[PDB]
């Protein structure tokens, strides 16, 4: 039952976006807008790393 | 002949047994609808009925 190791992959990297509730609604208001939203399934977002 | 039918009985027990186990090696969905999250990553031991 003991495990040996754990590997990852780092050239792609997920970003789980922690968010509130109502602002998503306002993002739903962006779904009622969609006008900065291009490539609509995805698009780029500028990182600000630490 | 009768003891041979006992051997065929245990034979169908084994073929059926591996047929249900080998049927449950693949993991599919119970019902339809939107999934939540995964819990376990690949290469990891899981248990039946855990």
User: Residue A27, SS3?
Assistant: helix
Distance CA B19, CA B13 (A): 10
Distance from CA of B31 to the nearest CA of A (A): 26
Interrupted after residues, chain A (C–N over 2.5 Å): none
Resolution, expressed in angstroms to one decimal:
6.5
What φ, ψ does residue A5 adopt, rounded to 5°? -150, -170
Distance from CA of A28 to the nearest CA of B (A): 19
Distance CA B1, CA A49 (A): 78
Optimal mutation site among B43, B44, B47, interface A, most CBs of chain A within 10 A: B43
């Amino acid at each position: 039952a003991t495990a040996l190791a754990t590997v990852q992959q780092l050239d792609p990297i997920y970003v789980d976006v922690t968010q509130s509730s109502n602002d998503f609604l306002r993002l739903k208001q962006e779904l009622a807008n969609g006008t900065l939203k291009q490539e609509n399934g995805k698009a780029k977002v500028s990182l600000i790393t630490s | 002949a009768q003891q041979a039918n006992a051997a065929v009985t245990a034979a169908k027990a084994a073929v059926e047994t591996a047929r249900i186990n080998l049927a449950y090696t693949k993991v599919t969905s119970p019902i339809s609808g939107r999934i939540g999250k995964s819990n376990v990553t690949e290469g990891a031991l899981v248990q039946n009925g855990q």
